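Q: What does the assembly look like in three dimensions?
Context provided by user:
Components: seven
Sequences:
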Amino acid sequence: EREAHMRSFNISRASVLQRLEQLSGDRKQESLPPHVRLDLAVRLAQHGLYQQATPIVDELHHQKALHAGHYALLINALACPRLGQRILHCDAQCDPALTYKLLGDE
Amino acid sequence: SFRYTNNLIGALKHRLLLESSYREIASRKFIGNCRGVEVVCSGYGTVLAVQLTDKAVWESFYRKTGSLDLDKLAESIKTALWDATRKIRSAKEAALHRSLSHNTRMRASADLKHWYEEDANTLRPLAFEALKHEAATPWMQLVQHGKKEEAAALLKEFEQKGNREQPPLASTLKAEDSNPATIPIGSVHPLFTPALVQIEEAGGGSVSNEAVCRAQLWELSRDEQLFWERVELIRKGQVASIGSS
Amino acid sequence: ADESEWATARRSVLDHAMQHEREWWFPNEMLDVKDVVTGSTNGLTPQMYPAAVRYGVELCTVLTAEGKFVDERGSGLSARCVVNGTGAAESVVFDTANCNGTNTTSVEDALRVAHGALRSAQDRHNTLAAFRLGPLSKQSQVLLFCGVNAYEFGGKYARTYAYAFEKAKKELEATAASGF
Amino acid sequence: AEKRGHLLPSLPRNTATSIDARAQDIRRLQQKHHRDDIVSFQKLLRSTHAEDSPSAFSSYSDWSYFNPRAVRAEERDRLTRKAVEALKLYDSATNDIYRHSFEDVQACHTQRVTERDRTMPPYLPTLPHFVAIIKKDPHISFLLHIGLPDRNSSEEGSAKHKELEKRIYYLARALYHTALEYHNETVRRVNRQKVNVAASLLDNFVEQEWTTILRDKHDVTDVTKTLNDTQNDKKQLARRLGRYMLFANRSLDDTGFPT
Amino acid sequence: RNEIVEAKKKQVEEVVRTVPSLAHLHQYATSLYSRIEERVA
Amino acid sequence: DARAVAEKKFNAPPPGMFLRPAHSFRRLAGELKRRRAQSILDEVARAQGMLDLFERQ
Amino acid sequence: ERRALWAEVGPISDVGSAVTAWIRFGNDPVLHTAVPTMLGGKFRNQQREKESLLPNSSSPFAYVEDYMGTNLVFGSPVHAKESAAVWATYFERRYAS
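A: Here is the predicted structure of the complete assembly.
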């Protein structure tokens, strides 16, 4: 069951990184709508990939496309609630205090 | 028993995750800003571009009438470069912690944290070996990353046929080069890479089962002759008969 | 370089390499190579070899290189940059003493000078590290390629290291760390 | 003296390479005080004086006439170190010319070199190993690059940088000397106190500059809210950095010693 | 002096045509020396 | 004189070791190491004797 | 026994594969060939040699011999007869035993 949860998280993280590489390669000069970049930054930050999401947030804040709820959505996604599920089911052995203790390492 | 083989598997899983993540960091952009100054670097720390986002609004801050600051601007380039270099070193620590988290749940890799003791100063990509890896030709980047079947085809088309916003290793290291299954046995460890290539195939990147079995079978013929020459030395056998004069 | 070109610059290089680049060219007994013949056998110990590479990597990380750049578009902008071994910059300074005629330089021109001063100083550090870690890694490849029978993965134990390499791959293939 | 020296310049004598008033003051600081090579790796780790002159203080234009033993001490120690490296070159050659038996080298290759236990570990504490750990601190890496003013721009920025580099090499050398005398317990209790006085020197300096660059930047008031920037700054990276973990508070494993 | 510097020049060009990897490394050295060398103007 | 008659007999080593053959890479580099380091030791003691001579010992 | 048979190819067969290997080892063809060569504490200068029968190469692979001072491959003919005299002396004493 631990290997199954690890496999599921790695497949989802690979899909998110492939979506990011597709939106960065094919859309080199075509400017994306702001909500697609917002959803991509949220899905990047939720999977523990915070460095790949912060230039998107800098561009969205510089374009003044972000509003009151979108900032709270980005900060809540920065707590990584998809890496937390893998650390729950594999690393912390389902101890919910140990998820907070082990998410501070990443 | 089998304490060496079970520890070698845990070390090579640590080396495969540290090789597949070095190819993820090096083919990536690291953008740091201070005050509208986009300093873009790659994973190797080389500055790709020193840009300015929205020149119309950031012109009045550096008073381009007036004279240029060259101290507000100089402290903005250095801060944006320092903020971009630490994101490289924070990504190498995320590469090391993910390499152990896939290993310490299987083979108790907390001791490999002690047996290696690596940090961002020692984890690859190193910024002072950035010249020979980034400024190399695309054929030389295919032979530095152990891709023989792709560098031989790029060499054949060299024979018969005849502010850059991208890191120079992004063309070589694609998304499929982040898999450890494609990583050969020669480049899994940059310390012993002059010696691990004899294990590897001549034309391919996989392990040559014929040459590996040949290196063992040459040792087995030498050690058997060392065995039976010592049985003759230690314990002599019974002597046959003659006729005394 | 001609010998006439080196002789006129021999005084100005060697006093700079003694004042500012002293730690780059000072002899360090763990790193320097005294002999090309017996460097791999007598000098470099195969047990002391991974500690010397770590000693050299940690040394060039904390050291200091410098590089300058002059604007090629007529302006007398000169920028001097000091770059560590991590890629970061310690000091960025501009020189306006060469150009008296001013107010014709945009902010895009000044960033292009600083981009050239960082590119010159980072390539200065990469060439200085290629001569400090240069001859040690050359004697390393003689010790490892011709000394596979002294190591844990040559001879009869090459089959074990290849078996552990394939077994490490299937344990990453069982999870999605390889197949994804 | 300069007129008589320039008339015979090819005569390779015992060189001084300074003026008459310059070499008198250079011999004044050399024979009355020790040189400062704290920021160097190789020279300070092998720093050793073969002789000293304590109960002697004369004029250095006349001390060469009164007591020529102490004024000839430096180039005599230079010939002493030249005698050792020739002998180290001599002892390295006997392994080159002479070899063991063939059955002896066969016995070595039965016990292969294993990376885990048979190799020396790469994380052994050296002198630049401790400078790299002490500069990996995000508060020290801030003050080295962007926290202090540039050493090339201003003359006070170089004074803050040389003071910062003095206390970095103080703590790194004390941690380097602790690992050398770690096998015995007598000097190890002393070297732990050498670290605690060297760590408190740097913790006093970092917390002095951190209160400086925060409070002085409170008086500049650069207003960039109209620019809609990314909120990176000199203050806004310093206040977003955490609390400064003091080096006197840290144990040995937090300052580079292996666990 | 001119007889030796063309003796090596045809010697290098025979080496380049036999080994096609060395023809690729001559293009690397010219592109690297354009980056490292201090420009004069 | 003892080094001469010992060298002429081989056409003194440490007791547990042997002698490499001539015209080999390690022996020629080792004999060049011994030839240069001997010349340093003559010029060190000679120049240090000039220091004691002009000190009026 | 059927998988592993005779082989005369070696790990590096030709010079064209040696160039491919020399870059994979971590070497820069400009930087790691521009290093000076030091022999006995004295650097080799402008390729000037005085009664030196050592080979002249900045590559340290050119001086590789056996532990017994034997180079039966690529050796000079005065050294290759002395290298074959060592193993003919050792295997005389070994096989007469």
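Follow-up: The radius of gyration of chain C is 24 Å.
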